[PDB]
């Protein structure tokens, strides 16, 4: 084929075949003419090398080349390699009725449905719309229907909502590693140009929303619609196939909304009042007469199913909070009240959904996963859980710990000037005292964050776990750990140079205090090594998955 212009961009195999035929014609003419021995030996040898270069180029000494120094691609190089026929056109194919766009959240969704734009929906479903238009009788020939959807008149959007309705689509994030990276949804049409994807499902795709893209595929035939609904639907994938752990675990905002909701404080509005049900618990929270965390005797009716498939009601007064009753309005019947009576971090909400799946089955667990996500988003919005510069509380004991460590390294180096100790024992003693001082700084800040709030109730003071914002983001398990909150308040440890050995002078400044120049440069050693490790680790991880699914 010619490219855009007036010349033909010729393939490499035409060069190979044209050389074999040029040489073969020369050899026939020389055997006609009775050339001497050395001429026809060179001629047959050039034909041998030409045939051997046509079949598998470069297996002989240095491969032939046309333009410019790059070798030209032979038949065996049309078969082998990453870009042969197996790995590039027979195992993986390019696919019609498919689309691709940037994802975004849309938290109003139920977890069996996803948002799909109107422009992509009218392009992916052109033949179904053509068939629907031809059934009604609005048009006649196929051309008329293609002009109608090329113009996009007022009547094809009702046709589109009547071809969408019960027709699943396969959403697919581009590095699909396990089977939960292709899931089938039902479309809900979107004014917009971005796929709205239900948030819980994101933890299956490893999909954040920092610029990600996903592909949509349409199951055309009827068996494929039934496979998308009965095997690949997103309600059907609620447990990861690698183990027994649920994969529709609530990820980050919703566990903060729950951890702020089901908690307590030693005095609030409506401390120790008594409530006749969870409905008036939410009514007291909404009207402005109690607080979301205020300990209260309620009367809840938990249904324990102790018989053989019969739900027995037991009603009692639990000493609980307001938020635990409001969250009890969403729990299905069979679970006991003690699943919400605690503080509900992330491990606790994961085993809440797991006990709901083991007891009440699939359909209450799907609808209860949605109600968890809705109430987590709503009370995280009502929480106003910001992050400030004052939330990262510096330990008051931090500077004296650093000065005691500086006195200790001064003692060790004064022994080093007088030669009492060895050099390796000096390096070991310095790394040991900076590890001990690091642990003491972490314990100072961790006490100063985990119990900083000290509020009185009707008299003398009484302490409790803190409502500091970074501490709830750490204790809830939403985002953060001990190490990250340690590096934002306490000293950020002893960073290591790329030699593999540690550096004897640590980074005594956290991020709330400023790092100076040398400390940031040592930090950049430690972080450049991590980025290089991930960006080179991913190739071995993918090649390991390939070898494993081809031995299986």
């Amino acid at each position: 084929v010619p490219l855009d212009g007036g010349r033909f961009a010729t393939s490499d195999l035409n060069d190979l075949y044209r050389r074999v035929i040029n040489r073969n014609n020369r050899l026939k003419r020389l055997l006609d003419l009775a050339a001497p021995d050395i001429i026809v030996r060179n001629e047959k040898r050039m034909l041998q090398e030409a045939v051997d270069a046509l079949l598998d180029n470069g297996r002989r000494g240095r491969a032939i080349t046309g333009s410019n120094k790059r070798p030209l691609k032979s038949l065996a190089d049309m078969i082998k390699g990453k870009q042969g026929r197996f790995r590039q056109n027979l195992l993986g194919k390019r696919v019609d009725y498919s689309g691709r766009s940037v994802i975004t959240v849309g938290p109003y969704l139920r977890l069996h449905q996803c948002g799909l734009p109107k422009k992509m929906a009218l392009e992916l479903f052109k033949p179904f719309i053509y068939g629907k238009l031809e059934l009604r009788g609005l048009a006649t020939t196929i051309k008329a229907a293609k002009k109608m959807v090329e113009r996009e008149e007022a009547v094809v959007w009702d046709i589109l909502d009547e071809v969408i309705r019960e027709h699943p689509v396969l959403l697919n994030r581009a590095p699909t590693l396990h089977r939960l990276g292709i899931q089938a949804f039902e479309p809900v049409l979107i004014e917009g140009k971005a796929i709205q994807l239900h948030p819980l499902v994101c933890a299956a795709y490893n999909a954040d929303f920092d610029g990600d893209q996903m592909a949509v595929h349409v199951p055309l035939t009827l068996e494929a619609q039934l496979e998308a609904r009965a095997l690949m639907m997103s309600t059907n994938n609620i447990l990861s196939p690698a183990n027994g752990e649920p994969i529709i675990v609530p990820s980050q905002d919703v566990v903060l909304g729950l951890y702020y909701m089901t908690r307590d404080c030693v005095n609030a509005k409506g401390e120790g009042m008594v409530l006749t049900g969870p409905k008036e618990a939410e009514r007291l929270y909404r009207s402005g007469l109690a607080s979301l965390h205020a300990r209260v005797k309620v009367r809840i009716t938990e249904y324990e199913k102790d018989a053989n498939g019969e739900l027995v009601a037991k009603t009692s007064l639990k000493d609980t909070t307001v938020g635990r009753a409001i969250l009890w309005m969403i729990v299905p019947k069979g679970l006991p009240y003690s699943i919400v009576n605690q503080a509900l971090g992330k491990k606790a909400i994961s085993k809440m959904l797991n006990t709901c799946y083991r007891i009440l089955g699939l359909k209450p667990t799907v609808i209860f996963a949605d109600q968890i996500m809705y109430t987590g988003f709503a009370y995280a919005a009502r929480s106003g859980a910001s992050v400030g510069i004052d939330d990262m509380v510096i330990p008051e004991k931090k500077h004296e710990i650093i000065s005691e460590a500086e006195a200790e390294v001064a003692e060790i180096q004064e022994q080093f000037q007088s030669g009492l100790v060895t050099a390796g024992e000096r390096y070991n003693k310095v790394i040991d005292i900076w590890a001990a001082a690091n642990d003491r700084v972490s314990k100072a800040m961790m006490d100063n964050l985990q119990t900083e709030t000290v509020i009185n109730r009707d008299g003398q003071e009484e302490k409790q776990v803190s409502f500091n914002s970074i501490y709830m983001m750490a204790d809830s398990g939403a985002r953060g750990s001990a190490a990250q909150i340690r590096q934002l308040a306490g000293m950020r440890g002893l960073m290591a140079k790329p030699d593999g050995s540690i550096i004897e002078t640590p980074i005594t400044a956290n991020f709330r205090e400023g790092l100076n120049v040398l400390q940031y440069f040592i930090s950049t050693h430690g972080a450049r090594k991590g980025l290089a490790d991930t960006a080179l680790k991913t190739a071995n991880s993918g090649y390991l998955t390939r070898r494993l699914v081809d031995v299986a």
């Binding site: 699909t176 396990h178 929303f209 920092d210 009827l222 905002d253 910001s386 100076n516």
Partner: protein, 1322 residues
């Protein structure tokens, strides 16, 4: 004092450390390199003169003619840069070289030549550099990126562990020339020394010594010291210097002087060496078992019989001693082969050597280098004497000789370019010393061992390739030269030089397309140091250590600005203050510290000098004298950050920005961010699109000014003065007299580049930021470019941001945006698309440009004229027609008429047409000809008249010393004017002088306008081949929408999720909604805490802005404004700014306060930024709460959010990953040729590659039918897909699968081998 656009809006500058060295010109690498390449520099170094003095004078092989050189020159470019980008030509210059051919007679080395000839011949065109550091190669604007490669000169590398699988180290030594053959020495685990040349076969290394005319005895003289056995009274005693016994076991009885020194069994200690030196012990009698393992040094022959006793390098036995003792050779020289220190590596290599003399050594080297073809005396000697020893094919440069003498601890640094005997012998000696223990290896990441190539060096190497090809051509033509009938262009040819230099500037791995969407991105693609390219490492192979940051990067390479992905740490970006060494290394400034007092003199160092000295830290507290206020200070000695004394240091860091680059020193509060998020923040900050309304970062670092000036996107004033401000077309600046030349009266007319296409389809546009009649100074800015605001650098815009979860719409990293952001068009960016249409004559006649578009009805002839082509302007979308361009016979007509692509809208801003000389109808082509024709003359006369007006007044102005008669000077109006005599006393010939000016003005204007019409009157200017050349420039205006990507400066990426109404936003109690809601959960994990301090400090900045907006709106007399502005500019600790505000004339306070009512801009520098107490104190100057947190109500429910939230102003950027460039869908369209599967991409309307892991994921489910239609019906099988399309549109979802076509393609490709693959029984 300040300049006049500095007093417009002076940014509140935190920062305690006084800067001593201002920032160098940020494009100096590119400009200094290319100014070195083209410059007339006598003494030859470096440049084009080095190329001509290497290649010339050419003399042929005794052909008695010798073409020599005189001088070169570069003429004017025929196309200036703008019309060069428009047309598509290179931006080049013709290289006029004077060449002087002299031709000899017979027998004239000394005789005078018989004839000369000389001419200014023309070879090539070299592409000049634009004033901003760019090229224009073929219409497009490209940048050569500076390479980072291994220096020439010896390197002693180890490879300690991986080979031999036994933990035994090797030690190789590579002599890397700048041009020529590579010579490597290397041990092997048998402890033998091996040479290899150009990574070829392995020769035992002493053969190269035997190739340098060294006998075996001379080699053993070099690499071994002699132990002397004297034949004496009995048992052949030994000279013993006591150094040789260090650390060995006493095998025999060590006694002398009648005294037993050391007995057998104990090892010899250094106290025993002191005993032997104090007792003066040299000669001791040895047993016969001591010599029975040693090796002879030189040869010995039996004197009377006349034959050989033993060859050199022969081990000794007792009967050999009975041979040599009875002959009469009294001295025996043995080789001291210490097992600890002085190993016998050369001697065992000589035992491996199959050669004996020089000639067989050269024959074996020639059989190594060029195999098959025979090894004769002349051929092998010419090979080996031109491998390393001739000036043509082997040349360590000056850098190579400096590194080569420095790594061998030589004294000198300048020497000859070739090697010698002594250099190869010294490399072998240092390698042996490293094996013995003394001296150590070199590392390759050490930036003293790592040179930079730049534009001038790379273009000079390519130009030298072209010159050696043209000298082989000149040697060709001259021996076939007949004289005198040729002049020097039948010999020389302009083709190979131009071919080579356009090969490099067009298709190389470093001459690459400029990332141009941003002033930052231009100025940080020009400052780029790539490890890749020719002669360097590759992306997909290496490695771990070359991708990692080494302690010599401090102040030379940015540690944190490197692109994430497949090439991390290969594409390093250069630091802010780092220049380039004379040899090409990276030297960075330091402040010389003689004693306690840190001196303000600067001094540049590279990494092979930074190790020796002790260099302080940038922020170490020194007060009022330079004395370090502590008695101990953190420094770094040899790449090790350690704490040293007050008075030991020799250098200090210059300024605290100097570690990082110009991409990541624009991030305020860098020191509070993590390193990873600073990397992601700088790499995204390169990617910002220019918004429609540029908006001044409230929290900047003060480096915005230098980046926005030094990248040439703003129209910086060349000569200061006032202004005339016609400006609709050009800024016209009248020049003050001190900066103004005596002749060339002169006023500067700046060209503003209005709406045009960038390289990334963004819009580069300049707008004047000075009014009419306003003073400007030299170096001041006049026109704000893209993403600039009054000379600062405004990539994104500053918006009110709340940190809270808001109903899930900002879940992972999403961002929830009000409607006030999209109503104000405060991200509505402008994109420009160039679309070409050509009507080439493929076949069956030429194609045609006519509106008479076929089949298609009264839906073709619409946005066009009666003669075809889009009629300009208009609200064109997708599926429209721009250029009717269709042929007959292609009832056989078709529609190739270039239309508008699917999904885009826009306005036709410009239509260019340099078409096939004929595009015209009956007259538009010549209709506009007269328009431009009359235009030229008009301005030509106008300009003359403009100067004439100024000159006429000037005539009268000077008319005072020679006729001031006001009533006797207003005679003729447009006729003459001055008519008075003068004589002498004072020179008033001024009238005569100005008379010539006007006289020459009119005389030159005619000629100027004479060529104007000549140029005007023309078909059009372009190349041949292509016929119909119609380029149409659309300009889409994209706003913002759910799905775009925004980001701050700290690494906080986001896809804007919901575009809320104004009402539903979280409003504080004052009533203002917040603009953008981010998510707090990103902040504890991604440890980029700097965005919060930017949020609080931007809140304080707009607090001052709201306070000034109240004091100026509710208008107060300027005393209260200058008092509040003075309080705002004093504010807190000891800073550098304060202000001199009472000298702003009671109006420059008000113009400043007009430019501050949107918020007071604050410079928070990079590592010496604003502390937290100053943020709190500035939040107390404004009336804002000290915590940074305001209680916010909810727009939905009207009720307060508990636990007050953070609101502030973050500077958020819109990155050019827009969602309606990514949205794509395909049902059915076109496919490829070879395969039956769909095409790929978006510009090709193609479908999604359902790859391999998705097939494994469908196999993981039970999706057997979904996969079957996913690879047979939807993709490949042609009968299956046509039956499926008809089955769908009938209303029958059922597939008739069949076999994929690409599998039958597989069968024919396998079967086209000798392979019979089939398909068996039914």
């Amino acid at each position: 004092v300040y300049s006049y656009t500095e007093k417009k809006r002076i940014r509140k500058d935190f920062g305690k450390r006084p800067q001593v060295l201002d920032v160098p010109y940020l494009l100096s690498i590119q400009l200094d390199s290319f100014q070195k390449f083209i410059e007339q520099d006598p003494e030859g170094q470096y440049g084009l003169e080095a190329a001509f003095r290497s290649v010339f004078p050419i003399q042929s092989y005794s052909g008695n003619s010798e073409l020599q050189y005189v001088s070169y020159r570069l003429g004017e470019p025929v196309f200036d840069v703008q019309e060069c980008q428009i047309r598509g030509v290179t931006y080049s210059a013709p290289l006029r070289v004077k060449l002087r051919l002299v031709i000899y007679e017979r027998e004239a080395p000394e005789g005078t030549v018989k004839d000369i000839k000389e001419q200014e011949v023309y070879m090539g065109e070299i592409p000049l550099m634009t004033d901003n550091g760019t090229f224009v190669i073929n219409g497009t604007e490209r940048v050569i990126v500076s390479q980072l490669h291994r220096s020439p000169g010896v390197f002693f590398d180890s490879d300690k562990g991986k080979t031999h699988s036994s933990g035994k180290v090797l030690y190789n030594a590579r002599i890397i020339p700048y041009r020529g053959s590579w010579l490597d020495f290397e041990f092997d685990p048998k402890d033998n020394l091996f040479v290899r040349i150009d990574r070829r076969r392995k020769l035992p290394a002493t053969i190269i010594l035997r190739a340098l005319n060294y006998t075996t005895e001379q080699i053993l003289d070099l690499f071994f010291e002699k132990v002397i056995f004297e034949i004496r009274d009995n048992k052949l005693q030994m000279e013993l210097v006591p150094e040789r016994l260090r650390g060995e076991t006493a095998s025999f009885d060590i006694e002398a002087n009648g005294k037993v020194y050391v007995e057998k069994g104990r090892r010899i200690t250094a106290r025993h060496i002191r005993q032997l030196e104090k007792d003066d012990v040299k000669l001791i009698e040895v047993p016969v078992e001591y010599i029975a393992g040693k090796v002879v040094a030189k040869d010995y022959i039996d004197e009377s019989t006349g034959e050989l006793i033993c060859a050199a390098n022969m081990e000794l036995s007792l009967d050999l001693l009975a041979k040599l003792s009875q002959s009469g050779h009294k001295r025996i020289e043995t080789l001291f082969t210490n097992d600890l220190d002085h190993g016998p590596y050369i001697s065992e290599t000589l035992r491996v050597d199959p050669t004996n003399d020089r000639l067989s050594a050269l024959v074996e080297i020639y059989r190594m280098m060029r195999p098959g073809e025979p090894p004769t005396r002349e051929a092998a000697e010419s090979l080996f004497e031109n491998l390393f020893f001739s000036e043509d094919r082997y040349d360590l440069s000056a850098v190579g000789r400096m590194k080569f003498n420095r790594s061998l601890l030589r004294e000198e640094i300048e020497g000859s370019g070739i090697l010698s005997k002594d250099d190869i012998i010294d490399v072998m000696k240092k390698l042996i010393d490293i094996r013995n223990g003394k001296g150590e290896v070199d590392d390759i990441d050490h930036l003293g061992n790592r040179r930079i190539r730049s534009v001038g060096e790379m273009a000079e190497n390519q130009f030298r390739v072209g010159l050696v090809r043209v000298e082989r051509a000149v040697k060709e033509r001259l021996s076939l030269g007949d004289l005198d009938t040729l002049m020097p262009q039948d010999m020389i040819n302009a083709k190979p030089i131009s071919a080579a230099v356009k090969e490099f500037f067009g298709s190389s791995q470093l001459s690459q397309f400029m990332d141009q969407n941003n002033p930052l991105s231009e100025i940080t693609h020009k400052r780029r140091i790539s490890a890749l390219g020719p002669g360097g490492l590759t992306r997909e192979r290496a490695g771990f250590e070359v991708r990692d940051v080494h302690p010599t990067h401090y102040g030379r390479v940015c540690p944190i600005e490197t692109p994430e992905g497949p090439n991390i740490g290969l594409i390093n970006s250069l630091s802010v203050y780092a220049q380039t060494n004379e040899y090409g290394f990276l030297e960075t400034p330091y402040r010389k510290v003689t004693d306690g007092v840190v001196t303000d003199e600067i001094h540049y160092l590279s990494a092979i000098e930074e190790g020796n000295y002790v260099i302080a830290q940038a922020n170490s507290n020194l007060d009022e004298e330079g004395h370090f206020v502590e008695d101990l200070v953190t420094c770094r000695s040899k790449g090790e950050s350690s704490l040293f004394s007050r008075d030991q240091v020799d250098y200090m860091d210059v300024s605290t920005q100097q570690v990082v680059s110009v991409g990541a020193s624009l991030i305020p509060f860098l020191e509070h961010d993590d390193a990873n998020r600073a990397l992601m923040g700088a790499n995204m900050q390169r990617q910002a699109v220019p918004t429609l309304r540029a908006d001044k970062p409230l929290v900047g670092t003060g480096m915005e000014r230098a980046v926005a000036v030094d990248s040439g996107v703003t129209a910086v004033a060349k000569r200061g003065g006032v202004v005339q401000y016609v400006d609709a077309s050009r800024i016209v600046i009248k020049v003050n007299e001190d900066e103004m030349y005596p002749g060339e009266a002169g006023i500067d007319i700046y060209n503003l580049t209005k709406y045009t296409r960038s390289n990334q389809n963004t819009c580069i546009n300049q707008m004047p930021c000075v009014s009419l009649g306003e003073p400007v100074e030299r170096g001041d800015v006049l026109a704000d470019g893209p993403s600039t605001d009054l000379g600062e650098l405004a990539l994104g815009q500053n918006m009110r941001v709340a940190f809270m979860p808001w109903n899930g719409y900002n879940f992972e990293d999403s961002i929830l945006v009000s409607e006030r952001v999209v109503q104000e068009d405060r991200f509505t960016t402008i994109h420009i698309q160039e679309l070409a249409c050509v009507s080439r004559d493929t076949k069956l006649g030429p194609e045609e440009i006519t509106a008479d578009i076929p089949n298609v009805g009264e839906a073709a002839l619409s946005k066009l004229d009666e003669s075809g082509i889009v009629y300009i302007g208009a609200e064109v979308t997708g599926g429209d027609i721009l250029v009717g361009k269709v042929t007959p016979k292609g009832s056989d007509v078709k529609d190739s008429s270039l239309r508008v692509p699917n999904g885009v809208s826009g306005t036709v801003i410009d239509v260019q047409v340099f078409t096939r000389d004929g595009v015209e109808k009956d007259k538009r082509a010549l209709e506009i000809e007269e328009m431009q024709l009359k235009q030229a003359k008009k301005d030509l006369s106008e300009e003359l008249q403009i100067l004439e007006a100024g000159l006429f007044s000037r005539i009268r102005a000077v008319l005072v010393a020679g006729g001031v008669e006001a009533e006797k000077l207003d005679k003729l109006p447009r006729d003459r004017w001055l008519e008075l005599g003068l004589t002498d006393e004072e020179k008033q010939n001024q009238l005569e002088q100005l008379a010539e000016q006007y006289d020459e003005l009119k005389h030159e204007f005619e000629k100027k306008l004479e060529a104007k019409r000549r140029k005007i009157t023309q078909g059009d200017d372009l190349a041949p081949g292509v016929l119909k050349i119609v380029k149409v420039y659309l300009a889409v205006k994209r706003r913002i929408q759910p799905g775009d990507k925004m980001a701050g400066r700290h690494g906080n990426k986001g896809v804007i999720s919901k575009i809320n109404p104004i009402e539903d936003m979280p409003y504080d109690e004052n009533g203002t909604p917040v603009d953008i809601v981010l998510n707090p959960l990103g902040v504890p994990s991604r440890m980029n805490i700097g965005q919060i301090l930017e949020t609080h400090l931007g809140m304080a900045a707009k607090g001052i802005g709201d306070k000034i907006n109240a004091m100026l709106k509710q208008q107060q007399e300027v005393a209260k404004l200058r008092e509040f502005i003075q309080r705002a500019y004093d504010l807190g600790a000891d800073v550098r700014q304060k202000v001199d505000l009472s000298t702003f004339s009671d109006e420059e306070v008000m113009r400043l306060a007009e430019n501050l009512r949107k918020g007071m801009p604050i410079a928070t520098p990079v590592f010496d930024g604003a502390k937290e107490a100053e943020i709190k104190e500035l939040l107390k100057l404004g009336d804002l709460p000290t915590s940074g947190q305001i209680r916010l109500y909810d727009g939905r429910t009207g009720e307060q959010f508990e636990r007050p939230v953070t609101v502030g102003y973050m500077y958020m950027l819109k990155l050019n990953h827009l969602v309606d460039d990514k949205m794509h869908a395909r049902s059915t369209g076109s496919y490829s040729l070879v395969t039956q599967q769909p095409l790929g991409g978006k510009a090709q309307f193609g479908g999604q590659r359902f790859g391999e892991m998705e097939v494994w994921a469908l196999e993981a489910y039970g999706a057997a039918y979904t996969l079957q239609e996913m690879l047979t019906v939807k993709s490949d099988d042609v009968n299956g897909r046509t039956k499926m399309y008809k089955n769908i549109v009938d209303g029958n979802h059922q597939m008739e699968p069949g076999m994929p076509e690409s599998f039958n393609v597989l069968l024919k490709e396998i079967r086209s081998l000798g392979i019979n693959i089939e398909l068996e029984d039914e």
